[PDB]
Design an enzyme around this catalytic site. Structure first.
Site, mmCIF file in Angstrom:
data_model
loop_
_atom_site.group_PDB
_atom_site.id
_atom_site.type_symbol
_atom_site.label_atom_id
_atom_site.label_comp_id
_atom_site.label_asym_id
_atom_site.label_seq_id
_atom_site.Cartn_x
_atom_site.Cartn_y
_atom_site.Cartn_z
ATOM 1 N N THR A 145 6.952 -0.282 5.812
ATOM 2 C CA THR A 145 6.174 -0.713 4.651
ATOM 3 C C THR A 145 4.842 -1.328 5.114
ATOM 4 O O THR A 145 4.822 -2.210 5.978
ATOM 5 C CB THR A 145 7.007 -1.589 3.683
ATOM 6 O OG1 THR A 145 6.208 -1.960 2.556
ATOM 7 C CG2 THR A 145 7.618 -2.821 4.345
ATOM 8 N N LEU A 195 0.827 -1.206 0.000
ATOM 9 C CA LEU A 195 0.000 0.000 0.000
ATOM 10 C C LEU A 195 0.860 1.254 0.000
ATOM 11 O O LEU A 195 0.518 2.226 -0.669
ATOM 12 C CB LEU A 195 -0.973 0.018 1.186
ATOM 13 C CG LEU A 195 -2.056 -1.047 1.201
ATOM 14 C CD1 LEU A 195 -2.634 -1.195 2.587
ATOM 15 C CD2 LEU A 195 -3.147 -0.743 0.186
ATOM 16 N N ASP A 229 1.402 13.796 17.336
ATOM 17 C CA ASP A 229 1.621 13.768 15.882
ATOM 18 C C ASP A 229 0.317 13.827 15.078
ATOM 19 O O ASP A 229 0.176 13.134 14.067
ATOM 20 C CB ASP A 229 2.495 12.565 15.460
ATOM 21 C CG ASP A 229 3.169 12.675 14.096
ATOM 22 O OD1 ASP A 229 3.713 11.654 13.617
ATOM 23 O OD2 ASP A 229 3.130 13.775 13.494
ATOM 24 N N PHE A 269 7.993 5.244 8.326
ATOM 25 C CA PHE A 269 7.362 4.238 9.189
ATOM 26 C C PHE A 269 7.876 2.819 8.896
ATOM 27 O O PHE A 269 8.242 2.090 9.823
ATOM 28 C CB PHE A 269 5.820 4.301 9.079
ATOM 29 C CG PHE A 269 5.247 4.466 7.684
ATOM 30 C CD1 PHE A 269 4.936 3.357 6.905
ATOM 31 C CD2 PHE A 269 4.972 5.729 7.172
ATOM 32 C CE1 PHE A 269 4.396 3.510 5.622
ATOM 33 C CE2 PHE A 269 4.434 5.881 5.888
ATOM 34 C CZ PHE A 269 4.148 4.771 5.124
HETATM 35 C C1 4Z8 Z 1 -2.430 3.975 1.003
HETATM 36 C C2 4Z8 Z 1 -2.934 3.289 2.250
HETATM 37 N N1 4Z8 Z 1 -3.942 2.469 2.242
HETATM 38 C C3 4Z8 Z 1 -4.169 2.006 3.497
HETATM 39 C C4 4Z8 Z 1 -5.099 1.113 4.044
HETATM 40 N N2 4Z8 Z 1 -5.094 0.847 5.338
HETATM 41 C C5 4Z8 Z 1 -4.207 1.371 6.184
HETATM 42 N N3 4Z8 Z 1 -4.334 0.953 7.519
HETATM 43 C C6 4Z8 Z 1 -3.760 1.490 8.667
HETATM 44 C C7 4Z8 Z 1 -4.429 1.377 9.900
HETATM 45 C C8 4Z8 Z 1 -3.820 1.922 11.025
HETATM 46 N N4 4Z8 Z 1 -2.633 2.523 10.904
HETATM 47 C C9 4Z8 Z 1 -2.031 2.627 9.721
HETATM 48 N N5 4Z8 Z 1 -0.783 3.206 9.613
HETATM 49 C C10 4Z8 Z 1 -0.604 4.568 9.092
HETATM 50 C C11 4Z8 Z 1 0.875 5.010 9.070
HETATM 51 C C12 4Z8 Z 1 1.614 4.528 10.333
HETATM 52 C C13 4Z8 Z 1 1.535 4.389 7.838
HETATM 53 C C14 4Z8 Z 1 0.968 6.525 8.943
HETATM 54 N N6 4Z8 Z 1 1.932 7.229 9.584
HETATM 55 O O1 4Z8 Z 1 0.183 7.141 8.237
HETATM 56 N N7 4Z8 Z 1 -2.568 2.096 8.635
HETATM 57 C C15 4Z8 Z 1 -3.224 2.255 5.714
HETATM 58 C C16 4Z8 Z 1 -3.198 2.600 4.350
HETATM 59 N N8 4Z8 Z 1 -2.429 3.420 3.523
HETATM 60 C C17 4Z8 Z 1 -1.261 4.252 3.890
HETATM 61 C C18 4Z8 Z 1 -1.548 5.275 4.997
HETATM 62 C C19 4Z8 Z 1 -0.027 3.398 4.195
#
Ligand code: 4Z8
Length: 300
Positions: free
Chosen positions: A29, A22, A139, A27
């Site tokens: 991958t 994704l 953050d 962070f």
């Molecule tokens: C493009 C995309 N499609 C996603 C679908 N589901 C999630 N799910 C989750 C759920 C909870 N936390 C996170 N992490 C967010 C992170 C740590 C990558 C951030 N700093 O934005 N992702 C994250 C997704 N993304 C990005 C933000 C990496």
């Protein structure tokens, strides 16, 4: 204080499958995935976050796992479980529409006043919940607000929950003081990011100049779609005195009143005629779509 009786769920590598990547960044991958637990006859759309294996990086991810497993609110991202591989990965809920920042940038032409104001209400609710649980985010930004459906957003990234200068309160930049009222400053900036359809705050200005700029009295400009009513709220989040800033519970109230008559508080050309995907759309929900349930409905 109160004992944290949250359950840390350990998930077998064989219980879930990685479909695609994704995103990759600071962070690590994040992968699109599916989780088929034991003999439950369910398929849960998941997001798998993974980190070379180093003892320090494993400590930091487990520190985030702790915080993420300790939350339970409709507008906050909960940890579903962890997988104890050599790499060690966090299993979270799939937010198919990604981050709100990229969403507002990519869909500005179909984003109306009702959506923006509802997102503001939702972020304030999740933030007020983090305050109830005595958790300071440290953050909060539009990048750390994920989209489950265009009508349902949740706060994420607990890697700092206990440096993004352009989202930080003056006390945080100058004295490293973080409070729920400093999260309110970050909230105001997040609202600004939405109201500008994903503009970079203080674009072109180096991070080292921010401290001096805020001390003089300079703040983020009034977005064109913003009435003085909405901008006043944003400005109140950016006061020198942290106690003078609004409380998240007041922000829920303020934005909810506005969400009842959105065109009186946000002026967007083409409003109401605009529409985004909904669970009432054709093919809104790749392999077998038979026994798939969302994580919000999968509760052991
Ligand atoms: C493009 C995309 N499609 C996603 C679908 N589901 C999630 N799910 C989750 C759920 C909870 N936390 C996170 N992490 C967010 C992170 C740590 C990558 C951030 N700093 O934005 N992702 C994250 C997704 N993304 C990005 C933000 C990496």
């Amino acid at each position: 204080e109160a004992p944290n009786q949250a359950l840390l769920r350990i998930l077998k590598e064989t219980e879930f499958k990685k479909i695609k990547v994704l995103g990759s960044g600071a962070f690590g991958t994040v992968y699109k995935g599916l989780w088929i637990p034991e003999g439950e006859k369910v398929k849960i759309p998941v997001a798998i976050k993974e980190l070379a294996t180093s003892p320090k990086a494993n400590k930091e991810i487990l520190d985030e796992a702790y915080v993420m497993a300790s939350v339970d609110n409709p507008h906050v991202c909960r940890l579903l479980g962890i997988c104890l591989t050599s790499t060690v990965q966090l299993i979270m809920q799939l937010m198919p529409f990604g981050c709100l920042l990229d969403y507002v940038r990519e869909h500005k032409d179909n984003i109306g006043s009702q959506y923006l104001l509802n997102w503001c209400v939702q972020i304030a609710k999740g933030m007020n919940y983090l305050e109830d649980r005595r958790l300071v985010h440290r953050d909060l930004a539009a990048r750390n607000v994920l989209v489950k459906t265009p009508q349902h957003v949740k706060i994420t990234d607990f890697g700092r929950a206990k440096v993004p200068i352009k989202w930080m309160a003056l006390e945080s930049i100058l004295h490293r003081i973080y409070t729920h009222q400093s999260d309110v400053w970050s909230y105001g900036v997040t609202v600004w990011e939405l109201m500008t359809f994903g503009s970079k705050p203080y674009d072109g200005i180096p991070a080292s100049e921010i401290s001096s700029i805020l001390e003089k009295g300079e703040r983020l400009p009034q977005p064109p779609i913003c009435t003085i009513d909405v901008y006043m709220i944003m400005v109140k989040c950016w006061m020198i005195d942290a106690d003078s800033r609004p409380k998240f519970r007041e922000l829920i109230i303020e934005f909810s009143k506005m969400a009842r008559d959105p065109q009186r508080y946000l002026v967007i050309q083409g409003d109401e005629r605009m529409h985004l995907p909904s669970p009432t759309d054709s093919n809104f929900y790749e392999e077998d779509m038979d026994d798939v349930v969302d994580a919000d409905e999968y509760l052991i």
